[PDB]
Amino acid sequence: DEVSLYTTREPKLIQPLLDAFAKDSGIKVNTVFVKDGLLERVRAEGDKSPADVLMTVDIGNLIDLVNGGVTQKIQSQTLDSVVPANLRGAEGSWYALSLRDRVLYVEKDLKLDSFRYGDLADPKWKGKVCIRSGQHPYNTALVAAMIAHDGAEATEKWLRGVKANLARKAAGGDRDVARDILGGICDIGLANAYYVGHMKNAEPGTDARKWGDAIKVVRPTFAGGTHVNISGAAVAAHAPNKANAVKLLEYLVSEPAQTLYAQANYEYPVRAGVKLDAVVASFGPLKVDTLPVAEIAKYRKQASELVDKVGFDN
Ligand SMILES: O=C([O-])C(=O)[O-]
Ligand SMILES: O=C([O-])C(=O)[O-]
Ligand SMILES: [Fe+3]
């Protein structure tokens, strides 16, 4: 009695919760870590692939699995009643498991209590904004959502305004935004909330905690909700243990599993009423963009092309 989880997530983030599932259910969980090329591996393994559940990060990566024919549709009242409609595919094709909101890091004492994404292009922020490469998936997803909401013309004008406002070249990573706010290079920047979970939970006497202490989170909205990307999962097209695969996926959205799952990378659980990490809770109420996240995949290439058009990374 077994189930195979193919995951692009390091099993370290999920081993305790998988062990609980196995203990309680009696179903052996086989964890297969696939660092990259998940689609390609499952395709190559063909009709007899051992894969039961496919787990990955980024809505585009998840939709690529579905469009690549390596998933199957499932019916589950458990999953559909837990996962909001905008965060799951039609007829059980894929499901979000956690939310990765892209927020504004803000110098801790700056007078700024709210923000719209569009505000980042205000001329007053010139020389005051940090951001990583505009071509990084975290950013192209946000740009894709902006096209969906506001159109290509408005999105291009935002990109040009933000580029004009950068304090340094769009490069590095998300936590570099916090470093550079601490360093007085910029006052605000776009980066993922979960990194602030990591930094603020780091122990005093680390550089991570020094960066965390330097900043606060303000969650911008579109107007209006905050942009989220996701981690998520789907049942594999040829799952040899389909009943167990559905059991595992249903378990992954249960309250106990969600509590552990989100805490692991300081992400936000998909299931309502799940206890948050204390740092994450301190960010205040989250309003999730009502946009179907599948729209992010729809507009991704257009978004990437706009980023290139404006020479965002120059
Ligand atoms: O994306 C990043 O910046 C990271 O994971 O460190
Ligand atoms: O895992 C991550 O967050 C990355 O590689 O950026
Ligand atoms: Fe990252």
User: Which domains are seen in the chain, by residue range?
Assistant: 1-97+225-274 (3.40.190.10), 98-224+275-314 (3.40.190.10)
Please say whether the beta carbons of 167 and 192 come within 8 A: no
Amino acid at 102: R
Q: Give the distance (Å) from ligand 3 centre to CA of residue 209.
A: 18
- Count CA atoms within 13 Å of residue 269 on its CB side: 22
In sequence order, the 6+-apart residues with CB closer than 8 A to the CB of 128 are: 165, 167, 186, 187, 188
Number of Cβ within 10 Å of residue 48's Cβ equals 7
- Phi and psi, residue 283, nearest 5°: -70, -10
Residue nearest (by alpha carbon) to ligand 1 atom 6 = 173
Residues preceding gaps in the chain (C to N > 2.5 Å):
223
Please say whether the beta carbons of 49 and 68 come within 8 A: no
| Distance from C-alpha of 95 to C-alpha of 144, rounded to nearest angstrom | 20
Q: Which two tokens stand for residue 239?
A: 């799952």
3-state DSSP assignment of residue 95:
strand
Please say whether the beta carbons of 8 and 38 come within 8 A: yes
| Distance from C-alpha of 148 to C-alpha of 98, rounded to nearest angstrom | 22
Distances (CA, A) of 131 to 16, 53, 86, 158, 303: 34, 34, 27, 14, 16
| Distance from C-alpha of 165 to C-alpha of 34, rounded to nearest angstrom | 39
| Distance from C-alpha of 52 to C-alpha of 27, rounded to nearest angstrom | 13
3-state DSSP assignment of residue 157:
helix
Which of 8, 54, 15 lies closest to 233 in space, CA to CA?
54
> Please, what's the largest Cα pairwise distance for the chain?
61
Distances (CA, A) of 87 to 69, 82, 117, 244, 268: 20, 10, 21, 23, 13
Which of 248, 253, 263 lies closest to 95 in space, CA to CA?
253
| Distance from C-alpha of 94 to C-alpha of 23, rounded to nearest angstrom | 26
Which atom of ligand 1 sits closest to the CA of residue 172?
3
Residue linked to tokens 């205040």:
284
Q: Give the distance (Å) from ligand 1 centre to CA of residue 175.
A: 7
| H helix or E strand, kind and range, residue 45 | helix 38-45
Segments in 224-299 forming alpha helices (H): 242-252, 255-264, 278-282, 294-298
| Distance from C-alpha of 131 to C-alpha of 61, rounded to nearest angstrom | 23
For ligand 1, say whether the CB of 172 is within 6 Å of any of its atoms: no
Is 195 annotated in some ligand binding site?
yes
3-state DSSP assignment of residue 260:
helix
Distances (CA, A) of 117 to 22, 49, 103, 163, 224: 43, 43, 9, 14, 11
Which DSSP symbol is given to 203? Answer: P
For ligand 1, say whether the CB of 174 is within 6 Å of any of its atoms: yes
Which of 79, 199, 190 lies closest to 129 in space, CA to CA?
190
| Given resolution (angstroms) | 1.5
Is 105 annotated in some ligand binding site?
no
Q: Strand 188-192 vs strand 129-130: parallel, antiparallel, or unpaired?
A: parallel
Exposed e or buried b for every residue in 99-126, given b needs 16+ CB within 10 A? bbbbbbbbbeeeeeeebebbbbbeeebe
| H helix or E strand, kind and range, residue 40 | helix 38-45
Q: Give the distance (Å) from ligand 3 centre to CA of residue 228.
A: 14
β strands within 22-152, DSSP E: 28-33, 53-57, 71-72, 95-107, 129-130
| Distance from C-alpha of 303 to C-alpha of 141, rounded to nearest angstrom | 8
Segments in 122-173 forming alpha helices (H): 137-150, 152-165
Please say whether the beta carbons of 57 and 34 come within 8 A: no
In sequence order, the 6+-apart residues with CB closer than 8 A to the CB of 40 are: none
Please say whether the beta carbons of 176 and 132 come within 8 A: yes
In sequence order, the 6+-apart residues with CB closer than 8 A to the CB of 213 are: 108, 200
Which of 201, 86, 191 lies closest to 130 in space, CA to CA?
191
Please say whether the beta carbons of 139 and 296 come within 8 A: no
For ligand 1, say whether the CB of 173 is within 6 Å of any of its atoms: yes
